[PDB]
């Protein structure tokens, strides 16, 4: 037996301006003979917490080749960290994915540093590897704190990406500080970007496990009620509805999914809609 | 260009008794330092059309390590074909995944040959890679024709696997045949296996795309109606309802998913439930 190769992909390390390391993983349509096959305009999706989602995003994109609405696909860019034996870097992502606030603890509030890194280092590095390709449109995907980053990017630098995909965004973080930025975004006078927001139905209302003691289950329900995933997301979507600075707002509750399990569904739908259903109908 | 290495995984080739080659891809929990870390009873899931689903199943399994209901995980076995630039082998799978019938065209009806290969070659080969591990329980997953195979395996050799996961089963292929097998299964006198059946809500009732012209859309709806994915699946589940030979029957319609897109959802939920929520509650 041999190691499992991943075709039509590559990875490389990049450093931000602060000297901190990133692992960038890239994949392209499986039907290409090589990286140089692609010419002309293509959509591109940037995925934060890259280590956790790259393979699913890659393979889901490849599965679209059999679908009738396939239009040549696009490029997957997973922005991750040097890791062994796990999918998340807790320390690094805590800084990279959370917006700056006066009461944020030490090691949080580095979202603007990270967004600058994505725009000024990751984007050109990817463009240099596909010199024949034009970046037709760009999407930023993130999950949990990653979803919080996606929302922050939309509200403070809306021109940076064409589409923002916030999967189960941690709106609860730091006393709902993201709503200050959302308010400022809608109240500013006005091509508008699009937003996709999603969450799992079990996040705010989790079902009981088999053999789980009642006291343990009630503790999980208490925590779920505090995080308020669905209702915070619905309140935000209500605030943004009818705003001229958004082209489209698409919201989805995934029935029977929790914070972990929803990731497979949300990244797959996110890239599929961005690649095949663009532009979205006005909403 | 450095290729993307896949950790905690391997692949090897295996030939059936006819000399036809199969690509067997295997992955194990990411937190294991090496493959010999695994000791004692573990669940195992066999996935047909292995090339299309191995990476998503693998990464979805790894994402479970961050979930509070994680119990240790299991082994993913993708049973596929030697392929380049594509995810399916149309000729090979047409034989391997369809049951024998008198009216089946040439190149179909080899499901029992394939199921024998899985049980007598793939299973012992995988067991030999983990000699310190015992197989606590075994699941068979397949999608489309693969879902038909899973149903066929349940109805004709129910003792072969503990759980059968039929994603969007192609019941249309020979409705008389697979429903004949289902009827015989329920009418036979009686540890019972479990069945998960799923489909996407857009399979039988697809929405119109943006800018799709009417004749093109009506043709898609006509095809969708003929395949009858939802109603054939519901008819089958109604026939199996209250059957003593089945421990549990779980049926799921994924809202807003088509035949391709639902694969990400169904394989992820399938392995998660089989790994973490076993045994299922009685139906």
Curated annotation (Swiss-Prot), chains A, B:
pH effect on activity, per entry: Optimum pH is 6.0-7.0.
Binding residue positions for triacetylfusarinine C: 93, 144-145, 170, 172, 259
SUPFAM superfamilies: alpha/beta-Hydrolases
Coiled-coil portions: none
GO terms for MF: hydrolase activity, acting on ester bonds
EC number: 3.1.-.-
Enzyme class: hydrolase
Phenotype upon gene inactivation: Eliminates TAFC esterase activity and causes increased intracellular accumulation of TAFC and TAFC hydrolysis products. Reduces the intracellular transfer rate of iron from TAFC to DF-FC and delays iron sensing. Causes a decreased radial growth rate under iron-depleted but not iron-replete conditions.
Annotated GO CC locations: cytoplasm
Family: Belongs to the esterase D family.
UniProt-recorded name of the protein: Siderophore triacetylfusarinine C esterase
């Amino acid at each position: 037996p041999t190691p499992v190769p991943l075709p039509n992909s590559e990875q490389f390390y990049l450093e931000n301006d602060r000297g901190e390391p990133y692992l960038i993983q890239v994949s392209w349509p499986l039907h290409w003979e090589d990286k140089q096959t692609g010419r002309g305009p293509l959509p591109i999706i940037y995925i934060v917490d890259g280590n956790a989602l790259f393979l699913t995003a890659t393979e889901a994109a490849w599965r679209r080749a059999a679908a009738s609405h396939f239009a040549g696909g696009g490029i997957i860019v997973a922005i991750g960290y040097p890791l062994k034996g796990k999918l998340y870097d807790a320390r690094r992502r805590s800084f990279d994915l959370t917006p700056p606030t006066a009461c944020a603890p030490v090691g949080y509030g580095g979202a603007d540093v990270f967004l600058d890194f994505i725009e000024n280092s990751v984007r050109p590095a990817v463009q240099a590897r596909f010199p024949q390709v034009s970046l037709a449109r760009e999407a930023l995907y993130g999950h949990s704190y990653g979803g919080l980053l996606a929302l922050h990017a939309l509200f403070t630098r809306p021109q940076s990406f064409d589409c923002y995909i916030a999967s189960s965004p941690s709106i609860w973080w730091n006393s709902l500080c993201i709503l200050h930025e959302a308010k400022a975004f809608v109240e500013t006078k006005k091509q508008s970007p699009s937003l996709m927001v999603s969450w799992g139905s079990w996040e705010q209302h989790p079902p009981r496990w088999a053999d789980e003691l009642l006291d343990h289950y009630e503790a999980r329900k208490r925590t779920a009620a505090e995080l308020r995933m669905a209702d915070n997301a619905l309140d935000l979507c209500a605030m943004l509805h009818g705003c001229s600075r958004l082209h489209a707002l698409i919201k989805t509750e995934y029935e029977g999914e929790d914070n972990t399990s929803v990731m497979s569904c949300s990244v797959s739908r996110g890239l599929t809609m961005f690649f095949e259903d663009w532009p979205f109908h006005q909403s």
